Symmetry: D3
Amino acid sequence: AKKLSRINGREFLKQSFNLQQQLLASQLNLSRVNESYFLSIIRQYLPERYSVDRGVVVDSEGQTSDQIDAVIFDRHYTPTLLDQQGHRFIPAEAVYAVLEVKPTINKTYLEYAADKAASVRKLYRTSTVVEHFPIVAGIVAIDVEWQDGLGKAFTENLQAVSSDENRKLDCGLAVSGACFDSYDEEIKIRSGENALIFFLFRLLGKLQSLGTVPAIDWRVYIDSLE
Amino acid sequence: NGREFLKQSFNLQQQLLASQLNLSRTITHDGTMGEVNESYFLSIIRQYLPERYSVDRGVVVDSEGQTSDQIDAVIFDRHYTPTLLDQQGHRFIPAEAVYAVLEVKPTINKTYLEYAADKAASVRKLYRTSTVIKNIYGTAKPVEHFPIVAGIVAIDVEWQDGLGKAFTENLQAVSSDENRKLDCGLAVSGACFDSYDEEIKIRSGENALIFFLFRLLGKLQSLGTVPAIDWRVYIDSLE
Amino acid sequence: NGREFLKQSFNLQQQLLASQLNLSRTITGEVNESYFLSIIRQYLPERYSVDRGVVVDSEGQTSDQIDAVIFDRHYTPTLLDQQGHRFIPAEAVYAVLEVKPTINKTYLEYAADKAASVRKLYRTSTVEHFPIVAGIVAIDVEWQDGLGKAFTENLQAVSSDENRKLDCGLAVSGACFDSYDEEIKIRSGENALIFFLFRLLGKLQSLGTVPAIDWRVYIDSLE
Amino acid sequence: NGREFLKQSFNLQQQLLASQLNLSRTITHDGTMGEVNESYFLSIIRQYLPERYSVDRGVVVDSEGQTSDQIDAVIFDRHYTPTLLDQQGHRFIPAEAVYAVLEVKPTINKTYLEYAADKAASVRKLYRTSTVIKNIYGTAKPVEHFPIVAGIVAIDVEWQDGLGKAFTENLQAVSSDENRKLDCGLAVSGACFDSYDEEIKIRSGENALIFFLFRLLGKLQSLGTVPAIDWRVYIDSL
Amino acid sequence: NGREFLKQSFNLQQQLLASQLNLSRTITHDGTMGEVNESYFLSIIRQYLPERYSVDRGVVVDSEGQTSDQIDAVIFDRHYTPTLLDQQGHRFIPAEAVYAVLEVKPTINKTYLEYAADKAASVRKLYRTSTVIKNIYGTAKPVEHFPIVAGIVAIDVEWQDGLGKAFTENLQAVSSDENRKLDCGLAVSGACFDSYDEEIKIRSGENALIFFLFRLLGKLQSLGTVPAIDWRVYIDSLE
Amino acid sequence: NGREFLKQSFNLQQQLLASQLNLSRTITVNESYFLSIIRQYLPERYSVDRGVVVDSEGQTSDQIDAVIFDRHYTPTLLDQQGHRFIPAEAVYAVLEVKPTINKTYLEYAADKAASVRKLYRTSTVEHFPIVAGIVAIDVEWQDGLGKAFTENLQAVSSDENRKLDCGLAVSGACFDSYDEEIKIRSGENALIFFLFRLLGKLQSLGTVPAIDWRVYIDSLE
């Protein structure tokens, strides 16, 4: 029976996120993956101005992304195309970020997550009523396959994919205890029990910097219909 | 394909709504079609609309104590606006929170156009305050009220030629008073109309629902958010 | 007509709340804040959230437990909490309300202590703050005078420390007060709940939306 | 104390219900330009009843394709019964799942008693199957359907004597046909009745709602759960 | 492996609950400036229990008008039992609907065992009717009531030896009066007990929560469904 | 007519399901579309969700697209919607959602079913066979559910662990062996037939039997 010492607000904050980090790792290590676990947690965390769900992004020209594990998008200003939870059909102009859930962070899964991101970023976003911002993209996994962790070879893998802004992966989380992002230009990496709280707050900081998706004339979606 | 899936999503919903509205018709003693249940239309337009909009059946009220008639689908704000301790299916909605009002009726004909217009007038006649809360060092935003949107949703159109010349002449007659104007309408059999661009624009066929919803969304978007008002006008008269 | 239905829709809820809080007082622990939370949650614009919990700041300090925190969730992240036991960052808080058995000196001082425990918390400016509203909700008023001389002196007394100021209160038996217009304004009778709620909303409106701060101040000292 | 809190919990909801239904009756011009709004009544009876009972506006259907009239408040099963892919506010309900039907109307008088009895008949005339899966003779008791309960909820009572002599004469007349029987009613002004014990039992005053609801529950409980039947009768004709 | 995921699912929830109750302890100065917040325990036991069981904070009432003390977590029926028009967080529960009551306290010690026992007794002393409704043929099935289960939930155990000799003597002393018997308890730091097998069985360590929950499930299961009784006994005294 | 409304409601949902599953195929299918409909249809005594089945000996199934299971008498192992962790004794049926009904995906769905049926179900306090099926957009054979199909299905059903009792193609086909003989329907009523026949089969199983859940904790220390 554990002797529990007295807690304060900072330790409760840390435990509230790290215990959920452990839960997610247990859940993902089993499903070897089911993104539902991650969706629950990031949905619970994000400000209500953000919605997050699995689905497909569409544009007003009728092109679609691949299937995306976690799309972070607007519903406050944006119509719903008569979809339901777990299977969204999301206008491209509503999208803030896309995250792909995979078993591990290696070169194969980073390329696959970048493929997914490019299928969303290539879609057409109207400016009929605007300053569109780049969609944030990332990868979520249990662990990192490299001995190095998120080390030499990992950083080298982003650099070679640096050229194509559509394949860019802005951020990532290994719930075993590592995260990265490039929100500050330089790639910043963290390790350990706070990886989840770091990933989530850094992502919220990046989303915040982008502001609300610009308001657009949704009737571009019906212009070619009869 | 993305465009076909968009078309199909809405058209299959259009067909579902037509079937449900028909299933819901009251049984008459005179062999006519009967009145319809609005609730499935509400669930669809609620699902569709951006979350800044709320929509429900209810009565609109103003700070002088006047009420509208019952409205099948009031589109209104809840992000900035209090609730008057009402319930799903019977909202009691302050007039300053109202964007639009829609009546769900059996058919588009002269009777139900006039009826929907009478409902619309009973909301548009309500008083909307321009009082705002003290703004101490802030730049004052003068409250500019927009006209409330009103419309009709029905199963079909009684005119054999649909939304044709006789329909349009009736709509104009009805809408020759601004309080009674019907901005828009939908027959889920396959027709919709609106005067959002001044000229009456009419569509027919499988895309009537998707056109009606996206056109309404664009009109709502042009209205902006209801202007902030001092809600205490609602308590100023009370003992 | 509409004014009478307006009055009834609130007054019957005032009576329902007085009935439940009256029961809770005879049974008692502390009086159960649940009915009050459900009513003020139903009333408030959706830009405001309201729940029981604890306020926390980026330096790790916490408030006392608060029966009803009115706070933002549209722009503010959730610290992985759940209904009935929120863990709310200080910069998201608009108001705090304590539900107590009665409005008297003891429970006014108690509510003021709870308010100070929230107002002492640090709110970052990293990217100007408004004063948090604080108040008391109770069944009745202990003085046979009501919200009279002894009440005014006691409110004036606690409200001399700005951390302890109680801006407002409600006795669901039929009394409310606030200092939103500087002068203490008192109302009595069947419309106390509707007055309390609309006046509180007007005060909240004047505060504006919580300012957008850089939430990463909450992780800056983690390793 | 506990009994006083019980009384107030129901009587204050009775007052809230009376307030809203009175408003709706006025705004619909006495149920002529619109239907009295049943939403507050639905929320209260849903909240009160055990979860084994569902309640909503809808239309009842049987396996032969016959449909009832629209009903303001159907009390029905969803624990053992499939849903026919509907949404809240307009249910498409198989007849074998129905416990009770209640009509919400402007007033209790001859006109609306006859109207409500006609609605009740449109439901009770539907066919309820006695077919069960694994129907081997001698292995189970045959299904025995119970009589569906029907009633009327209104703002007030129009007769000069309230729920007196003319009322009971009218009730007995519509109820001489088992299909048309009205078992119970509630006037939110403060009166209720039922024939659950054969004798017409009437209550008046502040406890009308609590009596109506507890007496209705007692009648429902005496019926038991809807009998389990073979839902494939609904597809056998297709 | 499925068994490790089972263990971790429950042990991580145990740590989460310990963490939340640890904070509540500190914030309330060990329950001296407010009660420990039961609602995180409620959410977990509500998630775990089969849907035949409802769980919430409230007061138990009987048909004679008597009430219990406030109870942190009543486990009760809603499938067959009416609601007395209450709300989440403050239920007003008929006594015939109650399976179990649990009190969340700062710690397991003599003071709080006695306090949890006094709460349990305030529920068990309430009158449960045996009146039963006749069916359409005039026949009612007699019923018999089971004893209500009661327990205590806390962050830790104050005694140096945990759930050892002093604890056992105190639990036996409290429980020698059946009204006050505490059948079970959980210290979320890592210990649980029950007397479901007519002898006190104690577990400690990382599996305390999963043991407590599954043992309580088994006890509830043995009770069966609450007996079906005539709810109109609640209205028999009213005019 | 009521039967026409009944038919129209289900067939329109069949068409919507076909359209939804077809979009996630062209892109690659997403089972959540199907889960929503079957959940809406089934009596509330049934729960349905994606997840993993587990037994008291710690073994697990493969991931299952749609498990039909009890939550009225059965505890929840502190899971959440979209990834359930379901005791084997709570399970009525499993269904795998795949692009098409053909040999390959019939074998894949049979494999999933075996991974659930192999699990140990305690009798501490007799067990019904778990129902297993496939849901798909269309049928590969030009024959439809033809002679090739029945030959392939009865090959898979030589092992009771791998039996596929039923299946649905939302293009307009369904089958089951609930009556021993394989019964096939085609056309616009495929969804309503599949769902009501499944409902009848579930009804025949009765409620999952009550068990002593202490077997899930017996080996923990």
